Structure 1
Amino acid sequence: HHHHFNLPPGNYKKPKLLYCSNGGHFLRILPDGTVDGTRDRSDQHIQFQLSAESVGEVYIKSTETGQYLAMDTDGLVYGSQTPNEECLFLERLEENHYNTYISKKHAEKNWFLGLKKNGSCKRGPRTHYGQKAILFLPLPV
């Protein structure tokens, strides 16, 4: 409805690393529910299992902790113990080659998952189409 329907090729069979081209960080969910990015490919918190709820709608779950990636009412990204409406993301292709993740709940506001150059997660309203922060590359684990 609010967005296009260009989808990336299937990547749910195996777990993946979500590499942000912005600052070259791997998305990470820490045990305490903290979300950020790290350049350390050896980190035990950067592996995710993605799954499709509906076509183009996914859950992003940490294989290490079982936490679900989510974005709160104030646009803050966090790790959820249980899956909820804040956990659904619209997985879309971007710039013909990357994957972008739009908060389903806040889709009309164009709130995306994104990482700054310093490895910090961006707040929902600070994200927008056109930024490098929103571009991810699913990499093999």
Structure 2
Amino acid sequence: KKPKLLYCSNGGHFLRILPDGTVDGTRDRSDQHIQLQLSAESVGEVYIKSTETGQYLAMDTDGLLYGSQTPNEECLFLERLEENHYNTYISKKHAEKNWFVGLKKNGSCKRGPRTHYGQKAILFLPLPVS
């Protein structure tokens, strides 16, 4: 465990959970809302928590990412380590569909159904921060 940044290979954005529950990315490394905490619920699954607001990254039923005040089943992701030290993160509540956490090249969140293995959108490199 520990405070990580999750760097998105697609446009070079840190995954950001804004206080209003909005999920996007920024290039600004000083941003308060890119500090995350990963917690292994079981072996395969992780929660990804903002260490600024205590919000947990979540995916709703339409594949939209949001920050959730309190850890429901929408907040659990499977962390699979990949080819290049980059991880991907699959929704649990929708694993069967292969909904990934992803960001677009402009830093916008990419809704789960538009993700697909092999895309740069879905690849996040965990970086110990400070």
* TM-score band w.r.t. shorter chain: over 0.9
How far off its partner does 1:21 sit?
Answer: 1.0
For 2:127, what is the secondary structure of its paired residue?
strand
**Unpaired segments ≥5 residues, structure 2:** none
For 1:27, what is the secondary structure of its paired residue?
strand
For 1:101, what is the secondary structure of its paired residue?
strand
Deviation sequence 1:37-59 (CA, Å, 0-9, x none): 00000101000000011101010
1:123 aligned to which of 86, 108, 111: 111
Using the alignment, how far apart are the partners of 2:26 and 2:74 within structure 1? 23
Structure whose residues are more often helix by fraction = 2
Using the alignment, how far apart are the partners of 1:88 and 1:123 within structure 2? 16
How far off its partner does 1:68 sit?
Answer: 0.3
Q: How does 1:34-113 map to 2 (within 5 A)?
A: 34-113=22-101
Runs of 4+ with deviation above 3 angstroms? none
**Unpaired segments ≥5 residues, structure 1:** 1-12
How far off its partner does 1:94 sit?
Answer: 2.2
Quick one: percent identity of the two aligned structures?
98
Using the alignment, how far apart are the partners of 2:34 and 2:84 within structure 1? 24
Is 1:29 matched with 2:17?
yes
For 1:86, what is the secondary structure of its paired residue?
helix
Using the alignment, how far apart are the partners of 1:108 and 1:94 within structure 2? 19
User: In the comparison of the two structures, how many residue pairs are matched?
Assistant: 129
- Taking structure 1 as the reference length, the TM-score comes to 0.89
How far off its partner does 1:76 sit?
Answer: 0.4
